[PDB]
Structure formats: structure tokens, C-alpha cells
Design a protein around this ligand. Structure first.
Ligand SMILES: *[C@@H](C(=O)CCCCCCCC)[C@@H](O)C(=O)NCCNC(=O)CCNC(=O)[C@H](O)C(C)(C)COP(*)(=O)O
Ligand SMILES: *[C@@H](C(=O)CCCCCCCC)[C@@H](O)C(=O)NCCNC(=O)CCNC(=O)[C@H](O)C(C)(C)COP(*)(=O)O
Lengths: 405, 76, 406, 77
């Protein structure tokens, strides 16, 4: 028989909380992670906001392992430790075990350290200034390599990259490993650094927010008529995807089962979605799921184009049976590769603690958002089935559907 | 900070060891847990700290803190 | 875990050939693809040799398509064009088709273009010098995004990245998608660009060959006792992974069935292999395979540390029944992210054309190859089952086993 | 005028979107085969050609061949 996959542990470092407790509080309160960045302004950009991680990471991780890591790996690492703790896994349980694996990625590796390495090459010292550690900080697989090694992972070990769907495809791929019976546990998630080196390339396409540099907590404002792009964010998240029989036999806490995973492709435009991909993606995630979506964490990035196409696709999927929607990115900003796992965790906390978090900074709605149930006030509700979406450049789409046992 | 104090701070920060467990006759590899990439980075930091160049031929000969301290003393 | 998966088409852009016919000829002749590199020498680098792609790409790709692409995406796009034609596939069959996906990656996105967009931003024109196309070029998923979009792919779409195992894991995951019955066809592969910006990061580690810059074709010399590091290379490759019944019912040409896929982790050293994880990876890929491995395409990068550890693991798995072994990287150099699929392609061409390609440049064979059958001259042989290993930094291991169809 | 601006713009736009003979009523997207990023890039090209920086609120409006000529003729440089 094909197996079932459940979430038995989570960890997160995000612009709105350094662990799941801080995040739970933020979600209930609609607290913004967005702040003004003197680094973005000093670089020459027109976006001066960001969802930064509010934590000095200097010296938190052992020298011998942190020497290989860029910030994406740092955040994913710290998230992993919390997830291992949450799942109640001892070292003997998950280390040196061929049935325990890890799939975790970033959207962009480390632009900061690819730039460092070249800047140092071109200087007076040459190779001597580069150092022997840039490759592992810059490779696209840094997040998985820098965690699989110190945590003694013996099973699957690789990253998925799919732009801003990255960490949701990681979770989905981890579920398929469980389903195929190849792994008992897979740590799944990702991380993303926060730096002008990569922010400025988004500004050059005019995708970031330019108008609210003086009012940072308002710049990210999904579904609002005067949204002017997304607020870039950094951070990390990790969940423990576990086979159901294995979780039961060890007495684990089960947040939820993953009952659906959709992954589709638009095959259309390189930077704007098609909605058609999203429709099939949510549909394939709901396939065989005999309960309704009680809550839907949208992808919603506060972009002109993005927010509408997803509401359109949402409207086509659900008929007169629409569920509630909020864009937590209105509080958090957009962590890119780490977005999917973080939003999976926000959705899991809404399910565990029976509320719906609000989409904030909607002063004036958008006409296309009519008839839809965009929850803008924290609301207590017994949720049973939740759904989260992530989309990315290149027309890549991911959907996860999560249900209580 | 003299030659010795600078040399031990470099060694200490990079190998993640308190600057008092850096014995003068400690071996990077045997006593302070350096691996081959630590070896590259340590030689590159020492080179920068004292503007001396350390050929590979010499770097293999430096197995101890004191040999490093002695190498820096006798090149400039 | 029940559908069977075959390769029905392939394409490749490589240091030893711009298509499979040229690649076949180089493979049989033991021809080197390594050349001297002005760019590398100019950068300050100690390694002045590389496996360059010898191809003028001017005009090969539509302007509205190539504007989004780094070189890695270019090589993979050209490889995919080849593979679609080689599979006998027309737009009506594979485009706008939800049962057709793409899994393809790179090891490092585009270091060249991340340094570009940063060199520009810090220059006079700032944001306008950067321009609006740098994200798709530098993002890690650029290879998959820049192909799935113009080929109108509708099924799965994402990259796997695992350092130098990248495109082998892509093929493996493509196979699992067929096995799970979620896809009828998955294009799987990868690409990597070739640039000082990325190569100097390897030089700084001590990872690259530096002692043979005068004789570039002898720098890559896996298993040679005087090997001194790998020779960086670039390129792309793509194979068409297809569900078996589907292939048979359309009269496809089938190169081989993918009968094994291993994917493990060392959990030990960030940059040196444990060998223990490779043993499990090779063992995992051989599971349920009732025919012996006739030929093994090792990862064999020409590193002092790397080559012997993999030989030790091959000994452990095979014991006194060594398959024929050769390291094609001695000819091709190391294409990083693209290495897996290109070596899967070489192994498929050895299987289709009945020969073992030579492990070149072995003047003195390392004492650790004892009891291993390292083939040093082209050998015509009817092969049935071949294996290919790929390893990466971070202790990541992949193995593919490919077998002729009964 | 035409060779003062209209032709020059017209040259700019035909090389940008890759097209031949662009008509004064043409829409970059609806007629000339462009998208958002092409037009972002076309604005840059019109800035190099005339040594001027086009404001954001104005560049937003430059989506037809006439909107391009009208902007360069009706302002500075
Ligand atoms: C993230 C993403 O997918 C791409 C970047 C991730 C990797 C970074 C690596 C750097 C080295 C977000 O862009 C995202 O979530 N995208 C998914 C779709 N959402 C969305 O809101 C669409 C965005 N598009 C637009 O804003 C316009 O369509 C745009 C930019 C094309 C304007 O041009 P035109 O359409 O007017
Ligand atoms: C490729 C790889 O895994 C990294 C890919 C990076 C992708 C692009 C990043 C852009 C910034 C090869 O490094 C590879 O295939 N590695 C796996 C095989 N290993 C191998 O051959 C041995 C490697 N290690 C060593 O040779 C030594 O460990 C060395 C010289 C690095 C340090 O010496 P110390 O251990 O004695």
C-alpha cells in the first residue's frame, strides 16, 4: 500500500517570529515584520523596506559548521533544530539512519557570497582573499548540503529550486518519498538570505514596493488598490514529514496529514502567471480530498498582477463554496524560497490553534476581489482542512492541502 | 599584540577554540582539529595578517603554532 | 511505485561534442575536450584549463526566449531541442499537455550574472544598468523556468540542485514521477555555465588541476597517480523519460529502461566523501536488478581525495566481480550540475552502440585501483546493464542503472 | 518630426520588439508582440537614444507608438 504522510514537528525563523510561539502571537495580532532598511537605501534602490529576521545570528552556530553556510542555510539550520525538538526526535532516532532524509532549498543560493567571491578575486589578494568556503555558500544546494552534513542525514539529500514555490515543492517531494516507502522521515523546508545583491535585481524589474519607504509596515498590502509591488523578506522554515504508521508507533504529536500536493506548470509567460496553471494545481491537490477547504493561505504578494490572477483561479476552482482567504505576506513580506514552508507553518498553526489570521493593510479593496471571503480580522474557527499556494517565475505552481487526522 | 598574540587569535577564531587552548606546541591537525580546508584558510589569514607569502612547500612544514610563529618571525 | 520508465530521446551540448553523433565519435576515439583558457588565466586563477563548449550559439534561440537565459539555460535549451527531435515528439504531443513535465537544474544558477547585476548596480547607471532580466538568469531554477515556459510544459516543473549530483537527481525524480503515474513524459537534465566567477571559487579550495596548464589535454587524469584536481567544464544535457506502455504504443525508439535509482547522504564531511554513503547509493540502485552491471561510469573527477574513495566503495559493493569501469571526465572535464545527465548520456551511448569508452590519461595507475577493472582503451562489447555514479559536496550521492529492454 | 523623433522612435521600437515598419497607432503589446518586460526595456532604449530619463508616472503611459513620440516631442532634450 501507498503510505500516508503527516507533519510531526516544525521550526521557523521569520520576519514575524523567531520560533513558532512568537509567530503564533504575531499571526493572532496582525503584527508586521516589515521595517526600513538603511542597507537597501544605501545600495541605490527605490525599495527601502523588508521583512528582516530580528535576531543576531553571529556566533549562534558552531564555527566548524557555520563556516560553510550562507544566511539561507543559517536560517534553515536554526529552523531544523526547532523542528527536531518539536518532533521529539533524539539524535539516535534521526542520525546515521538511511530512512531519514532532507529536502530543502533556496530560490537563489547566495547572491551575497557569489558577489563577495568575485569582488575578492578582482582585488589585490586574488585567490588569497576568496577563501576556501565560497562554493558551499554560493551553490544552489547550500541549504540541503549545510544541514544534511552536521545533522548526520543518511537518506535522501538534495534541494528543490522553483523560485517562490521552492520550499513548497520541497515539502511535496518529501511527501512522495514517504508515499513511495523510500523514507520514514524527511526534513523539508528551506531558507533565503536577505541582501541588496538580490533585492536590487527585483527592483530593476519594478517588482518591489517603492512608495511607502516612509511607512514600512504599510508597504506590503495584498489586495489593496494602491499596492505597488512586494516587500522582500528573508528567513527559514522546516517541517518534519513522517510516515503515519511510523509516527503513531513512536507516540509523536501529529499536527496534520498532507492529503494533497499539486505541482503544475503554466507553459505561458516567464514573469506573469496564467491562472490556468494554478487552477489545475489546486484541483490536483484537492483530488480525492472529501472535505472542503476551510481556509486558504494565498500566495498573495501585494503585486498588481499577481493578486488578481490567483483570485481568478480561486474563483474557478471553488464555486459557490468558496473558503476564507488571507495573505500572510501582508504581515511577513515575501521570503521567496522560504515562503512556501513558512506559509505551510502559518497554516499549520491556524489549524492547531483554531483561528484564521488576517490579511492586513487592505484600506481600499480591489474590484476583482469581490464576492470573495478575504478574512481581515482574526477569527476563531474550528478548522479541519487548510490549503496553501505558492507560485513562481517560470510559471511553476505548488499547492499543499493539510487536514487533521 | 605581538607576533605570537596575533597568530594565536587567528588560529583560535578559525578553529573555534578558546585562545588559551592554543598551546605553542599544539598541532593544527592533531591537537586543534583543523581539516584540509581549515589549513587553507589559516595559511591565507596568516599571509594577510603579516603580508608574508607562504609557499605550499613551506605551509606543509608548518604543523604547529610555534612553527607558524617561528615562520612569521623569520621572513620579515 | 509500479510504472516502468524508459529513455526515448536524448540531447547534449558538451566539451566533446555539440550533439550525440559528435559525442559518440569523441567517446570512441578517447578524444579530449579540454583546452587552455585565456579567461581563467586572466582572472588570477592557478587553473588555466577548462572543458569549453565549442559552439557559436548566435541566433540558435528566439530573441523573446533567450533574453531570460544564462548560459546554463542556453545549453539545456539546445539539449532539449535535440532530445525532443530525437524522441520523435511534435508540439501537439508534448505542449500544453498536463501529463508532460520538466525537471532540470544547475549546480549554481548564474554566478556570472549575479556578479553582473551587482557590478552594474554599483556603477554609474545603477538600476537601469542592471536591467529587468537578471532574476531569471541568476535564480537557481532558471534552467527549468527558462525551458518549461517556451516549450509550453504543463506538468511538473522545477529544478533539483545537489551540487555535482544535480542532474542525476533530476533524472531519478523524473523516473519517480512516472512510477507514481503522475506524468507520462518528463524531460530531465541540466546545464551549467563556464566562467571565472565560479571557477575561482573552486581554485581557492585547492579543488582544480593546476600542474598541467602547458599540456591541457592531460590535466584531467582520473585514477592517475599524479592527478592534481578536476578540470572545470560547462554544458548541458537532456533525456526524455517516458512511461513504458506510452513509449511502446507510439513506436518510440527506446534506449534503455531506468531500472535503478539510488539517492543517499553521507552525513559526514562537507567536502570529502565518506564512501559509506556511496556504497549504500550503489547498493540501492542495484536493488531488484537481476542482471550484472556490465559497465560503470564512475563520478571520477581526477581529485586525489575523490577518486580513491569511490574505488574503495566500488570494491565494497562488487567484491571480486568488478564491472568494467572508466571515468569519462578524464576526456570531458567536470560539468558540475550537468555532469550527471551528460554521463547518463555517455552511458546510454555506450549501451546503444556496444562499446566501453576509455578512461584516458592514466600513465601510472593509483595503487588503490587494485582488483578493479579500469578500461583504458576503447573496447567493443555488447553491454546490457550500465551504472553511473554522481557525487556532490554536502555528502550527496546519486546512482542510475540503465538496462536494455529485454 | 520624423527623423527628428518619429523616425528615431520608430527605429528604437522596431529594433527593440524586433519588428519592421511600426505604425503610429500600434500598441506594443496588442500589435507589436511585446510584454511588460519588453516595454520596460523599450523605455530604457528610448532613454539612451535621447539622453533623458523618463519619469515613472510617464513611462507607465508609454504603451503605444504615438505615446512614445508624443512624450519625446512634447518634452525635453
Ligand atoms: C518570486 C519568484 O517566483 C521569483 C524570484 C525567486 C528567486 C530569486 C532568486 C534570485 C537570485 C515572486 O516573484 C513570486 O512570488 N512570483 C510568483 C507570481 N506572483 C506574482 O505576483 C507575479 C509577479 N509578476 C509581476 O509583478 C508582473 O507580472 C511583472 C513583474 C511581469 C510586471 O511586468 P508586466 O506583467 O507589467
Ligand atoms: C562538484 C561539487 O560537488 C560542487 C558543485 C558546486 C555547484 C556550483 C557552485 C557555484 C558557486 C565537485 O566538487 C564534486 O563533484 N565533488 C564531489 C566529489 N568529491 C571529490 O572528488 C573530492 C573533493 N574533495 C577534495 O578534493 C578535498 O576535500 C579538498 C581538496 C577540497 C580539500 O582537501 P582536504 O579534504 O584534504
Amino acid at each position: 500500500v501507498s503510505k500516508r504522510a503527516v507533519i510531526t514537528g516544525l521550526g521557523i525563523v521569520s520576519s514575524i517570529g523567531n520560533n513558532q510561539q512568537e509567530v503564533l502571537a504575531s499571526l493572532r495580532e496582525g503584527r508586521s515584520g516589515i521595517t526600513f532598511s538603511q542597507e537597501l537605501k544605501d545600495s541605490g534602490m527605490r525599495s527601502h523596506v523588508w521583512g528582516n529576521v530580528k535576531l543576531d545570528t553571529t556566533g549562534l552556530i558552531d564555527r566548524k559548521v557555520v563556516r560553510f553556510m550562507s544566511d539561507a542555510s543559517i536560517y534553515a539550520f536554526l529552523s531544523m533544530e526547532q523542528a527536531i525538538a518539536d518532533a521529539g526526535l533524539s539524535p539516535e532516532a534521526y542520525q546515521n539512519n538511511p530512512r531519514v532524509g532532507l529536502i530543502a532549498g533556496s530560490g537563489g543560493g547566495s547572491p551575497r557570497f557569489q558577489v563577495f567571491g568575485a569582488d575578492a578575486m578582482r582585488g589585490p589578494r586574488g585567490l588569497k582573499a576568496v577563501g576556501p568556503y565560497v562554493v558551499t555558500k554560493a551553490m544552489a544546494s547550500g541549504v540541503s548540503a549545510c544541514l544534511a552534513t552536521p545533522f548526520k542525514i543518511h537518506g535522501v539529500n538534495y534541494s528543490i529550486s522553483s523560485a517562490c514555490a521552492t520550499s513548497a515543492h520541497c515539502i511535496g517531494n518529501a511527501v512522495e518519498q514517504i508515499q513511495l516507502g523510500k523514507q520514514d522521515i524527511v526534513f523539508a523546508g528551506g531558507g533565503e538570505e536577505l541582501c541588496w545583491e538580490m533585492a536590487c535585481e527585483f527592483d530593476a524589474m519594478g517588482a518591489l514596493s517603492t512608495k511607502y519607504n516612509d511607512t514600512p509596515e504599510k508597504a506590503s498590502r495584498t489586495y489593496d488598490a494602491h499596492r505597488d509591488g512586494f516587500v522582500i523578506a528573508g528567513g527559514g522554515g522546516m517541517v518534519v514529514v513522517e510516515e503515519l504508521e511510523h509516527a503513531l508507533a513512536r507516540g509523536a504529536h501529529i499536527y496534520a496529514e498532507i492529503v494533497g500536493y499539486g505541482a503544475t506548470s503554466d507553459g505561458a509567460d516567464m514573469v506573469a502567471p496564467s491562472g490556468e496553471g494554478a487552477v489545475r494545481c489546486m484541483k490536483m491537490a484537492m483530488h480525492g480530498v472529501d472535505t472542503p477547504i476551510d481556509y486558504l493561505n494565498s500566495h498573495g504578494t501585494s503585486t498588481p498582477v499577481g493578486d488578481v490572477k490567483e483570485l481568478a483561479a480561486i474563483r474557478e476552482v471553488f464555486g459557490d463554496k468558496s473558503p476564507a482567504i488571507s495573505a500572510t505576506k501582508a504581515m511577513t513580506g515575501h521570503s521567496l524560497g522560504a515562503a512556501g514552508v513558512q506559509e505551510a507553518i502559518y497554516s499549520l498553526l491556524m489549524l492547531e490553534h483554531g483561528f484564521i489570521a488576517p490579511s492586513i493593510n487592505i484600506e481600499e479593496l480591489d474590484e476583482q476581489a469581490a464576492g470573495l471571503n478575504i478574512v481581515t480580522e482574526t477569527t476563531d474557527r474550528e478548522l479541519t482542512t487548510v490549503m496553501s499556494n505558492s507560485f513562481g517565475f517560470g510559471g511553476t505552481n505548488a499547492t499543499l492541502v493539510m487536514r487533521k487526522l | 599584540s605581538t607576533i605570537e598574540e596575533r597568530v594565536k587569535k587567528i588560529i583560535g577564531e578559525q578553529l573555534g577554540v578558546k585562545q588559551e587552548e592554543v598551546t605553542n606546541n599544539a598541532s593544527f591537525v592533531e591537537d586543534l582539529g583543523a581539516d584540509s580546508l581549515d589549513t587553507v584558510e589559516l595559511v591565507m589569514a596568516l599571509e594577510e595578517e603579516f603580508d608574508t607569502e607562504i609557499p605550499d612547500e613551506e605551509a606543509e612544514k608548518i604543523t604547529t603554532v610555534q612553527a607558524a610563529i617561528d615562520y612569521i618571525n623569520g621572513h620579515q
